[PDB]
Design a binder for this molecule. Structure first.
Ligand SMILES: C#Cc1cccc(CC(=O)Nc2cncc3ccccc23)c1
Ligand SMILES: C#Cc1cccc(CC(=O)Nc2cncc3ccccc23)c1
Lengths: 304, 304
């Protein structure tokens, strides 16, 4: 028992982290096979970071300008190319520590582990969710660019995020491993609206099921609701509307606790309308939305 | 910017995890050099787990009874010994992945990362604190025994905890790497009082400094206090008394924000006496005590 914001073991990803230096900028790169993936803003200076012409800036660069170091060993760059907002630096040596991997684009509301890195060196690992508005509420300082987000299924690492930018609001923006930004963000130092965020309803419900599994039951009530009535409450409190697909993904947790998804929705409705009343659920005094139904089953069953 | 419950990258520890099977019990072991460390209750059955005579139970065991597997390879056991509540199984091969390491006994209120494991395989990593009452509020299922807690200083892994037991209250108990239990706990399936817990005051203050560094400032007030007045409030709210050593450890955070430790104590006093008033600090609606002053500086400066 016990419920924690658990991240995947970072070992497989630590073995892929390299340092990428171009001109005066240093950031992190991801070494998979004979390719190093890093944010394309590694080629920028402070002057052109307000409105960079990436094509023009990359034309002034040759393979020898991209200094790539894996710990204390220098990788030899034999090709470079820009794909969307990422640079792919072909190296003459395949990473001996390349795990089984995939590049995936996650959906908003899905979760992933982030291995924060500086100068190609891992500093820490944390779990987070891709917000409905495509930002991440991470913990990143200058030099963290190129740190990646991922999920692990047995031995396969699914890379879903590469960190690029911190918005003036303090939230984080980045791309998939093909360099496509999540959200409307551009790699420019400019005002960028993150857009209205919402609470991931399906995840809060999944977390309520984890709370019941782990003994926290005070919030369970004698009521039930319908998807329509619950969605009126979700509307009022800036929660994502709940669909039948969400109810279906909550099937296993509903079967495990024997608490019908709509009865759990009525518990969430009462919590939204009345608050916690100074109480806690799984050590939190607010409704937690960074655990998916899959995360809850994974943690509550012990998949390795 | 951004503040997360960050765990150390688990790579160095993942490389040490093995599976240990004795009779019908399987749990995790830690392979460092030519020694495998695991909880001594691996030699128990369900019948003798109520009051085990470990010396007697271990006498019925030979080296060949301890099945140790590292992934898919079998380690050959050439010696076994009990030290307090841990078994040390000498193996004929040193772990090629042994990192630079130390065995340390942490103080209550200190933090550490836990790599939860099942059948010698890493499932996840999370950060937690050793409670003032020597329990840990972890996330562990059956088979997690032998999962270890650690801190990392550059390349040196300091192992501080080995998981042994879940109390009937759902909290966790374990030992240092010499097999000494933290707290009054014994490796017996019996009623065990965890003792009155308290909130780690120095850590809450450190977290309040992290909140100021990361933009959350609403809680700052026009007041100050003394250690005596603050300790009267800490007494009333079951917070650990604040000492000059704690004030001294908060020195760097006090210097960084320019907010005197006693002025921050007055902010904490107002929060304790009035609550959050439905507001949040670093995404939490309660006062967080799982970040030490060192953790806050580490995360806010980016040490790798
Ligand atoms: C795309 C892009 C882009 C645009 C301008 C500038 C940059 C650089 C940049 O935003 N890097 C950082 C990322 N994370 C956290 C940080 C915290 C403090 C300072 C910098 C941070 C990227
Ligand atoms: C010392 C000791 C001792 C005494 C009796 C029994 C055991 C076994 C034991 O407590 N293992 C577990 C540890 N963590 C979480 C668990 C969750 C569900 C079931 C078992 C769990 C150890």
């Amino acid at each position: 028992s016990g419920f924690r914001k658990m991240a995947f073991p970072s070992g497989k990803v630590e073995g892929c982290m390299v340092q990428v230096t171009c001109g005066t900028t240093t950031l992190n790169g991801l070494w998979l096979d004979d390719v190093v993936y890093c944010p394309r803003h590694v080629i920028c200076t402070s002057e052109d970071m307000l409105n960079p012409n990436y094509e023009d800036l990359l034309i002034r660069k040759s393979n020898h300008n991209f200094l790539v170091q894996a710990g204390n060993v220098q990788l030899r760059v034999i090709g470079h190319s820009m794909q969307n907002c990422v640079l792919k630096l072909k190296v003459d040596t395949a990473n001996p520590k390349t795990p089984k991997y995939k590049f995936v684009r996650i959906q908003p509301g899905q979760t992933f582990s982030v291995l924060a890195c500086y100068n190609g060196s891992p500093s820490g690992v944390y779990q987070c969710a891709m917000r409905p508005n495509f930002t991440i509420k991470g913990s990143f300082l200058n030099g963290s660019c190129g740190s990646v987000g991922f999920n692990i299924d047995y031995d396969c690492v699914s890379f879903c995020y590469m960190h690029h930018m911190e918005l003036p609001t303090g939230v984080h923006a980045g791309t998939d491993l093909e360099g496509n930004f999540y959200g409307p963000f551009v790699d420019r130092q400019t005002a960028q609206a993150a857009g209205t965020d919402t609470t991931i309803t399906v995840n809060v419900l999944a977390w309520l099921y984890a709370a019941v599994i782990n003994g926290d039951r005070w919030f369970l009530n004698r009521f039930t609701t319908t998807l329509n009535d619950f969605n009126l409450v979700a509307m009022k409190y800036n929660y994502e509307p709940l669909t039948q697909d969400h109810v279906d993904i909550l099937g296993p947790l509903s079967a495990q606790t024997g608490i019908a998804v709509l009865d759990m929705c009525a518990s969430l409705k009462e919590l939204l309308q009345n608050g916690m009343n100074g109480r806690t659920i799984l050590g939190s005094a607010l409704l937690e939305d960074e655990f998916t139904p899959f995360d809850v089953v994974r943690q509550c069953s012990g998949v390795t």
